[PDB]
Amino acid sequence: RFDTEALEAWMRQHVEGFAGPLSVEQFKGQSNPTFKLVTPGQTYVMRAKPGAIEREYRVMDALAGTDVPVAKMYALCEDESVIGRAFYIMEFVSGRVLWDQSLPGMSPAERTAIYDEMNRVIAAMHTVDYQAIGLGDYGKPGNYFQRQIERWTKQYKLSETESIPAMDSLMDWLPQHIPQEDADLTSIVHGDYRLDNLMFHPTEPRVLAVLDWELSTLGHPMGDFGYHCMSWHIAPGQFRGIAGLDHAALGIPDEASYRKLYEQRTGRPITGDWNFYLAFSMFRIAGILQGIMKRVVDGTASSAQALDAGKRARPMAEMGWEYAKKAKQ
Amino acid sequence: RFDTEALEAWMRQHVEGFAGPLSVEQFKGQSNPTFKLVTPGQTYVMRAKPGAIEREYRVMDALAGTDVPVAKMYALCEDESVIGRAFYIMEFVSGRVLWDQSLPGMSPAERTAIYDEMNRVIAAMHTVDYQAIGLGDYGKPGNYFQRQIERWTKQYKLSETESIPAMDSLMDWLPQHIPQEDADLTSIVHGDYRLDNLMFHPTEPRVLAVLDWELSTLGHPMGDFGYHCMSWHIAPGQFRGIAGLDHAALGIPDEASYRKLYEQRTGRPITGDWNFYLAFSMFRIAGILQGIMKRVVDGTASSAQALDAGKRARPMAEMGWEYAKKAKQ
Ligand SMILES: [Ca+2]
Ligand SMILES: [Ca+2]
């Protein structure tokens, strides 16, 4: 509920090519409010807040011109005078957000293409020269895994609602097993890279825009790629994984081939125990899910969706520990 | 707490080669009591009851002389006069009961052998001429899946503790999709065929005895083989599955190869939608696990182990529905 004329005035000076009249609509749902700004010349998307939005804008803006396809940025407004809250203006991209990783409704050749493009974008993101595009201080590089292991160890300990031995074993195992090979390697890391955070062209298997960058920073690629590969280790039905489905029939590549393709795109081979990267990723996911459980156990979020995600903490922790034990020691 | 002299008298007349003195010990745990009968000449195992033990004895006895390795039977006692309860006497077999399906501690070649032998025994069981060994009326053959779908549909409806849409979809989907190809095919079905129900030779990869036959009957092989293949579709950590582990590295065969081997041993190819067989198996398992939840929700079994198994009903039901949707319609 704000002054749309004050915005139209601001947009004339700060949004390239802008020309009213302007009509604001809202989207049903996204942490911070999202609106659809409509003008005859074109449509934009405004991301406001009640009253770290600026990092999304920053990373997405810096990536224009790279191979990581992203929505075009128009303007960021930190001056809460104009509308009563901070916001930014983006392009309104139109396309498909696919949810089910098994890609129902497609031919095998199509599934191959969706997966191949999805691969290409992660390789591209991780090969970007983040310093040349001005993101040099976008996050703290080096010492990624020990920083993260410690963070999530402290977080679980704060939210622990029950004794989960596999979690405890993880918290003790991980810190003593951080690969030494490529420990300093850093790149832009999306944070939550997966199929449903991609906007595909309405009919072609090509991503028009990588979405939800609010968790992104500078970090180790395998923290990002490892989380992305979870799909091959989680089974279908709540957490829409693809473990045990007949991938060769469906046209979905095997994880061995997917990693190999990523290695060739990025030019460097994945050194370091793959089971550690997986074990870490499962640990992290367990930590996040325990956060939800702790809030559900003392009623901050009672949602059916919420306690569903909370009950999944233990099995994630348990699965993490199993992969840990398959790793070098 | 019984008369061991009355048993020694009975054993002289009913147990081939018996000769005391006799010393009875008990085993820690097995539904119906189990004892270790010790004599200088040899050791036996006695399976009593408080006060369908006879089917185990019957099937295990009939299988002697076949390729399904089993403990040797000595005598069945239904005359509750002798000891105050019905019982039977078996050979005391000594060997390994392996629990973890990933087979830690082994070389790849060893894992290949454990799996290959495990395959051989199921093929063998399912190729046995049950009528020639006198089990013709051991169960009701034909119409297996519809009989089972109906049984578990009624069972879930009796124990339903919450709304599980994937379960409901299964209960409606399955009955309308029972394969018509090989619908009458029947064989002996173990019921719960898995690694931990096998007693391996202490150092060789060969099964000395298939255990826990209390659920066995006559039925469709894929009800038994499908349950056995669950391992490739369930992930590690609570339900010790092998979904997503690097099978080629570990020396564990891929499910495609495992089924192919079974087909060659049994001489007939698996006709009928594999995803239906899997979907059915997941449905059945969900039903059994909901039984436990219903008892836990109203306190018949409060055990930590019990509510762990009860919480697994939904995900099993949800995973079943996903495989159902990959099947022919
Ligand atoms: Ca999203
Ligand atoms: Ca057992």
From TrEMBL, chains A, B:
Specify which residues bind Ca(2+) according to the UniProt entry for this protein: N197, D212
Task: Please give one Gene Ontology molecular function term for this protein.
Answer: transferase activity
Keyword Flavoprotein: yes or no? no
This protein's name? Aminoglycoside phosphotransferase
Q: Where is the Aminoglycoside phosphotransferase domain?
A: 24-238
Query: InterPro entries recorded for this chain?
Result: ACAD10-like, ACAD10_11_N, Aminoglycoside_PTrfase, Kinase-like_dom_sf
* Source organism per UniProt: Cupriavidus pinatubonensis (strain JMP 134 / LMG 1197)
What Gene3D superfamilies does the record tag this protein with? 3.90.1200.10, Phosphorylase Kinase, domain 1 (3.30.200.20)
Cite the entry's keywords alphabetically.
Answer: Calcium, Metal-binding, Transferase
